[PDB]
Design a protein around this ligand. Structure first.
Ligand SMILES: Nc1ncnc2c1ncn2[C@@H]1O[C@H](COP(=O)(O)OP(=O)(O)O)[C@@H](O)[C@H]1O
Ligand SMILES: [Mg+2]
Ligand SMILES: [Mg+2]
Lengths: 373, 171, 140
């Protein structure tokens, strides 16, 4: 951690940060900025103008919240700078001018956006060297292949990213503004409609844990609903932080069913199986066969037991009857983007691939699009 | 003094003393943070004793009256912010993100709901302490219950004597 | 694009022989610790024995001389194979075989004019039938 390269995966909802060579990110926190709801009824009394990450989450009951990433793209730059500052100084506790930093990039990111992040990293954080890698490409590569279609379902956004020999096909990338935080919120709603009351920020955290520990994707949703209504076999008990034990039934599979049926939250969109199929269909007919046999899942929202089998069933139903369909769900898929970056940045052969501060000063902003992965 | 000063001294002698006792059992940063919380609560008691026998002041007199509490709240917060590498960072965060509850005395209205919100911010961190230490040592579970009891008792104390705000003397 | 791992002298010379059709099969492995591409095997391999060459316990690169008929012509075509058997491979192994593939193929074409006809990515040797190889190289 002396001069070790840093890996920063700025997610739509979660920052995954750490040191190149580690098996897991050292810091994982919300990519969110919170501001007081009212001007102030009291002076000072420890009040701050803004709060970042977990400090924003703990005080969400008295704040307005804002994600610096909108529709999967960095949008609120002063807020993103607050999150980057927090990552270096409060979470990783490093001097950024001492560490080469690898940053990840979301699908369809404009050239000017990558230039903006690079400008902030070199001029504002004074990083000695930098590198940008595409999230979906790092996950596909970490899965053991260079051609396939990545389903990246994270916190605020889900993408279908077709990739050919490490190059994403921008014309065919599909976006769904539905992922992890939306499922937590929907689980809160259906547990409330059941009679439970999860309202406070700590209760939102309990619901997020219930989702991550007990939710699953049913292979046949309607068959599962009929079993749940006639039998208690799908019921699972959950221990609350205070030791109280609750019982969860059909909410286990109704919550991630939203990914396949966005109408569950009233969202007018096709489900993740249909957007995968549509993304494959936008590509040239000759690559489609390789895409169908290489559906790779990444991101925390692809962690549900049964999601791979469900996607296999749904893509089979849409694709030609003779098409070989395969879903690859690596066990590391929750952090595959970060892990991929960690492996890369730790290689001795990578030390010559960084864009140095010297290189940036000489070639200008266009150097980030030339030095690629 | 007046019933609300007596009731605050009972709050200091009961959940606060339990919190100080559990913080001492954990020691280190937790013990150091507790002494700063205690200083804050003692500064609040002094303001309650002043308010019990004096009419509602304004501007400079009121700012001078509330400034020691405001400054001690910042001292509690600064400690946590200067100790991010602490082995008890969720304990420190539960305190720093909730200590503004002492600021209820500055509110023109609804002090009770404000202390409730501060208690909810502490619970974001105390639930992390419970999850990490429920199988480690009971003293951490006891510390969480002791710290949170200060704010549930403070809310009961506010509802009883200062429902619409700090009950300054009329005469 | 990708990460460039230096190819050993023996691996280069084996590939040189394959480009001259002195060899018909070249298996390359990544030395993870040394960040190099080394020679694993150059065993005589006819299409019927190609499935036997794909390891089940680790990822490998393969350059195979695919001798076959296509529309009246007898072709002797170099096929590249990146075989990755699954979770028996560590995430570092999967990441490095994926990341090193493109610079290896770039240097093989540039320095040896290998003219790789097709690049294939497989899970196991059993899928390397004559039908599969034909349909991969000559689709539709
Ligand atoms: N085991 C799990 N099962 C289901 N959802 C999970 C699991 N682990 C994490 N998540 C969810 O994944 C989301 C974060 O995913 P991530 O890929 O890090 O998002 P992003 O990169 O967009 O920030 C959160 O909404 C979280 O609750
Ligand atoms: Mg992500
Ligand atoms: Mg394949």
């Amino acid at each position: 951690d002396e001069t070790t390269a840093l890996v920063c995966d700025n997610g739509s909802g979660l920052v995954k940060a750490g040191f190149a060579g580690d098996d897991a990110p050292r810091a994982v926190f919300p990519s969110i900025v919170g501001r007081p709801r009212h001007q102030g009824v009291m002076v000072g009394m420890g009040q701050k103008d803004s709060y970042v990450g977990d400090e924003a989450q703990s005080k969400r009951g008295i704040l307005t919240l804002k994600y610096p990433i909108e529709h999967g793209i960095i949008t609120n730059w002063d807020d993103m700078e607050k999150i980057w500052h927090h990552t270096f100084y409060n979470e990783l506790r490093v001097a950024p001018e001492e560490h080469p930093t690898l940053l990840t990039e979301a699908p369809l990111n404009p050239k000017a956006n990558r230039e903006k992040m690079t400008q902030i990293m070199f001029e504002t954080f004074n990083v000695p060297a930098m590198y940008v890698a595409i999230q979906a490409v790092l996950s596909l590569y970490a899965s053991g292949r260079t051609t396939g279609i990545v389903l990246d379902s994270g916190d605020g956004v889900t993408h279908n990213v077709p990739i050919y020999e490490g190059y994403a096909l921008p014309h065919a990338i599909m976006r769904l503004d539905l992922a992890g935080r939306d499922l937590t919120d929907y689980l809160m709603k259906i547990l409330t409609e059941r009679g439970y009351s999860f309202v406070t920020t700590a209760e939102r955290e309990i619901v997020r844990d219930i989702k991550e520990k007990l939710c699953y994707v049913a292979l046949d949703f309607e068959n599962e609903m009929a079993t749940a209504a006639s039998s208690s076999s799908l019921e699972k008990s959950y221990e609350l932080p205070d030791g109280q034990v609750i019982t969860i039934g059909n909410e286990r599979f109704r919550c991630p069913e939203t990914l396949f049926q966005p109408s569950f939250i009233g969202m007018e969109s096709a489900g993740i199986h249909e957007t995968t199929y549509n993304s494959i269909m936008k590509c040239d007919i000759d690559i489609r066969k390789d895409l169908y046999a290489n559906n790779v899942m990444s991101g925390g929202t692809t962690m549900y037991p049964g999601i791979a089998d469900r996607m296999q069933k749904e893509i089979t139903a849409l694709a030609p009857s003779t098409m070989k369909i395969k879903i690859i769900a690596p066990p590391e898929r929750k952090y595959s983007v970060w892990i991929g970056g960690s492996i890369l940045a730790s290689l001795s052969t990578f030390q010559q691939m960084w864009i140095t501060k010297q290189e940036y000063d000489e070639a200008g902003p266009s150097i980030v699009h030339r030095k690629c992965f | 003094a007046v019933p609300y000063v007596q009731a605050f001294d009972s709050l200091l002698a009961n959940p606060v003393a339990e919190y100080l006792k559990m913080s001492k059992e954990i020691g280190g940063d937790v013990q150091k943070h507790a002494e700063m919380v205690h200083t804050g609560l003692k500064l609040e008691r002094a303001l309650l004793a002043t308010a019990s026998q004096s009419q509602q002041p304004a501007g400079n007199k009121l700012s001078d009256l509330l400034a020691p509490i405001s400054e001690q709240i910042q001292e509690v917060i600064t400690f946590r912010e200067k100790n991010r590498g602490s082995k008890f960072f969720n304990h420190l965060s539960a305190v720093s993100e909730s200590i503004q509850a002492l600021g209820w005395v500055a509110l023109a209205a609804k002090p009770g709901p404000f202390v409730k919100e501060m208690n909810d911010a502490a619970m974001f961190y105390t639930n992390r302490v419970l999850k990490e230490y429920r199988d480690v040592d009971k003293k951490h579970v006891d510390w969480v219950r002791a710290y949170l009891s200060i704010w549930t008792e403070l809310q009961a104390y506010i509802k009883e004597f200062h429902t619409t705000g700090l009950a300054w003397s009329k005469t | 694009q990708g990460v460039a791992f230096p190819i050993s002298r023996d691996a280069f010379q084996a590939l040189e022989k394959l480009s001259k059709k002195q060899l018909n099969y070249v298996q390359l492995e990544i030395d993870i610790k040394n960040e190099t591409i080394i020679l694993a095997n150059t065993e005589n391999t006819e299409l019927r024995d190609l499935p036997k060459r794909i390891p089940k316990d680790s990822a490998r690169y393969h350059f195979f001389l695919y001798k076959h008929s296509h529309e009246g012509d007898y072709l002797e075509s170099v096929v590249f194979i990146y075989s990755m058997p699954g979770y028996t491979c560590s995430i570092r192994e999967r990441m490095l075989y994926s990341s090193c593939k493109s610079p290896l193929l770039e240097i093989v074409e540039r320095q040896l004019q290998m003219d790789v006809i097709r690049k294939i990515e497989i899970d196991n040797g059993d899928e390397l039938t004559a039908d599969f190889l034909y349909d991969e190289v000559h689709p539709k």
